[PDB]
Amino acid sequence: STGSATTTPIDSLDDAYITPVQIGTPAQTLNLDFDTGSSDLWVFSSETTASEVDGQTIYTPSKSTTAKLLSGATWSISYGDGSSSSGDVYTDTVSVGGLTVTGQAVESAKKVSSSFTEDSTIDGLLGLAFSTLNTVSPTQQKTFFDNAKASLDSPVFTADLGYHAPGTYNFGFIDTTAYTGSITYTAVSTKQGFWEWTSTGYAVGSGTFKSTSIDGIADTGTTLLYLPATVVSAYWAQVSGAKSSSSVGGYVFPCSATLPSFTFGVGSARIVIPGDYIDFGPISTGSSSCFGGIQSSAGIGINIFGDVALKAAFVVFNGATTPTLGFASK
What we know:
Radius of gyration: 20 Å
PDB class: hydrolase
Strand content: 35-45%
Assembly: monomeric
Largest sheet: 7 strands, mixed
Name: Endothiapepsin
CATH topology of the largest domain: Cathepsin D, subunit A, domain 1
Entry title: Endothiapepsin in complex with ligand (3R,5R)-3-(2-((methyl(prop-2-yn-1-yl)amino)methyl)thiazol-4-yl)-5-(3-(2-nitrophenyl)-1,2,4-oxadiazol-5-yl)pyrrolidin-3-ol (CBWS-SE-163.1)
Keywords: Endothiapepsin, ligand complex, hydrolase
Number of strands: 24
Distance between the termini: 25 Å
Oligomer: monomer
């Protein structure tokens, strides 16, 4: 089998991307944030505290003839941005772009943190990291990809995120028309449950390439590119007036600037992020200070190749027995 679904930025900044997902019978379509950095499929639901729902589409398991309570199972998750959510668990039929998994764990939110409530366009998350990170207790549950894997033509999914434009998530096949050149594959460590890999270095703008190993994760659920403070300082040093602001919480730069590109290494290959992809616009409406798309990972404990990096590439998440990651220019 295969599946293919369009993913769409939630806003003009590409803060996140939502993909329609069919849950239950008859289908209830929710727009989920596909997150290669987590491993829970959780949704706003008829069980979510009413005060914490602000415009999201909810999953109502009582209206699905295929929903079954996963008796005794609960879930609870905290994310990098202090956001959290928790609740109980159903199994139901879940379809993405024509690819169907029966008996998928659908985690129904009883509570969500305010970051999710404020995101009226995101109805939930669909985790695509390794199932070892799934928070369901006492019986850990498999991701949608893990459940679909054996049925897929190839045990892969691909992320082709657009820049200020829709993109595509495919399951089970590689669209060889979706990228230029070749896909360079690189080793993945699953030891932390992530699509964790090592970039071979970086360049800023037209500068030469600095060979240096950068261990990080491919995370479609993170907006920005988080890299070591040394690398981030070398980037922003090329932008007149750019500086790190503790009050804002990262590097800002004059909105009048044109930003240099940023290249990252995948083996001997190179992915070039255009400078415009690094511009996240005014820190507040009308401000002439703009927020940078490359930020320091120093306080996080891991480097994160978020959407800023991933949307510059066609990315293969190869879930073969030995997982690998593939990157191609596009």
